[PDB]
Amino acid sequence: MREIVHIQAGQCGNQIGAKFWEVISDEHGIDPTGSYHGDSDLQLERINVYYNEATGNKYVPRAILVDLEPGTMDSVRSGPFGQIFRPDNFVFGQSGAGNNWAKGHYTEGAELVDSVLDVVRKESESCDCLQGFQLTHSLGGGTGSGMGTLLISKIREEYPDRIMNTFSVMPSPKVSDTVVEPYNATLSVHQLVENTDETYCIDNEALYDICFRTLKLTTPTYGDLNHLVSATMSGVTTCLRFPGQLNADLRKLAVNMVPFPRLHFFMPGFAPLTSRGSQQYRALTVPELTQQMFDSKNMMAACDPRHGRYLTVAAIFRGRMSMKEVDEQMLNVQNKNSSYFVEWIPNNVKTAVCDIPPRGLKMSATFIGNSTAIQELFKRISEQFTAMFRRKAFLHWYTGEGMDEMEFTEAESNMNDLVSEYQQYQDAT
């Protein structure tokens, strides 16, 4: 079978995985020690996709934690699952990027990437055959912006034909948590357009609206924000782990969901999402989940999908279902909302049916769309970018680290072409 290498960059990224790796082990029934105590054996059938075996019945997650620049490190070790990682995989350095891109990609990355790329090739040859390189990081910051994109330039070079997903937490257009946030967006995405197969563009403001308007929560903590993102990750590799009546490879997604080799910037989605005690006044069916998935306030993208056009969508369904109901609900949406989509594409929807739901639920789903509604987001960042650069605002923290003025002009016109060539296809042609 195929196996997946999992990489974490940035202060954001490993905090995502710290909840996420708890979810996968609870999806199979694995202790903090690695002792398997699941219920059935059906979850044992694809342990190998993430977990390799150890000496006495122990399973080790193949997670290479690049981002443990030492302050972030001990928290991961002093967590719920600090006693589950192989401690030699904690690959890190000292005196980090400091929310500087060039300190992530040009100066301190060169003093760490040789210690990283070797550990990549360690877990690589322990696999039968590879496809999976799940980088978990954010844009906007430091390590996730400069040290994250450094590996994607390198691991593509050693592995030219492997599936490359980066579940990058994008910047927010209103809540700016970083002063240099447009300067880290334009540079890091300039790597991502060149050498990614897909990416899950995620905002926190979309996570803010979902936790508050839909889940009705008072105080959303970052463990609870990312638990929404952790639901996306396990839903996609559901079929590469569980037997489904219409399976879903990452590459089955990564041939269907992408028309053109550059336009592979995805927005995720998830359902069910509700606020209750234990009595909730609804009923789980196929059209129950379907209407929830296609909602403009149920996006993890922070954009109106009705403003843009859906190029293509992906309905990855879990749990026991019925294909005709699955087929016709995807049919009825493309009928009643045909003016929304890209009209000159024959089918605008595909399906994917796993046969096993998660633990608590009885049915579930995972929306993955690719739209010209994400044309808004880079427009909401490149305008923030181009106001800083004309006044030449933060250059002396970048030119004094090994960068150049001609690099910035080269950086945005890459991003200026995406919003240009999303306007070609949001237009009715």
Binding site: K392, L395, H396, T399
Partner: protein
């Protein structure tokens, strides 16, 4: 050897956009009873070998400007015109030693006119001021025929005569 040559590119632009009224030691240096004059030493052969850059303009007879390189808030080079209105602005090239005579002429009168005609020599180390009052004017071995005091200590006996 090779400092920033664009330093000098900054200099020459102010030069070729204006009039310049130089000043030499071949003119009647009029009287005011008071002044503060200027005279610089020539650029040495060593400084040329090290590519020392010009720093002065002599735009006028009674004014001088310094060429100071500076930097802005984006590390962009800036040049300052230290506009110094003075009385007498002589060049380092025009040292014919009549500067003392042109300085002595008003003073050689005063004491003989019954007055107190004084002076002072002010300058930096290595600025050529021992070559400016203590003499002698050759710049090689201080040849004992051009004692700069003697250019009016002659007057002490000659204007006496």
């Amino acid at each position: 050897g090779n400092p920033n040559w664009e330093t000098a590119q900054m200099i020459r632009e102010y030069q070729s956009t204006l009039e310049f009224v130089p000043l030499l030691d071949g003119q009647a240096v009029d009287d005011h009873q008071i002044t503060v004059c200027v005279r610089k030493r020539p650029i040495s052969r060593k400084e040329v070998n090290r590519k020392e850059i010009d720093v002065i303009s002599v735009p006028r007879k009674d004014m001088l400007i310094v060429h100071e390189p500076r930097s802005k808030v984006d590390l962009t080079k800036f040049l300052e015109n230290h506009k110094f209105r003075f009385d007498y602005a002589f060049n380092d090239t025009c040292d014919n030693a009549m500067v003392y005579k042109y300085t002595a002429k008003p003073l050689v009168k005063t004491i003989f006119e019954g007055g107190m005609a004084t002076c002072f020599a002010y300058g930096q180390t290595g600025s050529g001021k021992t070559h400016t009052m203590g003499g002698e004017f050759n710049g090689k071995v201080q040849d004992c025929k051009n004692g700069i005091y003697a250019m009016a200590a002659k007057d002490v006996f000659v204007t006496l005569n």
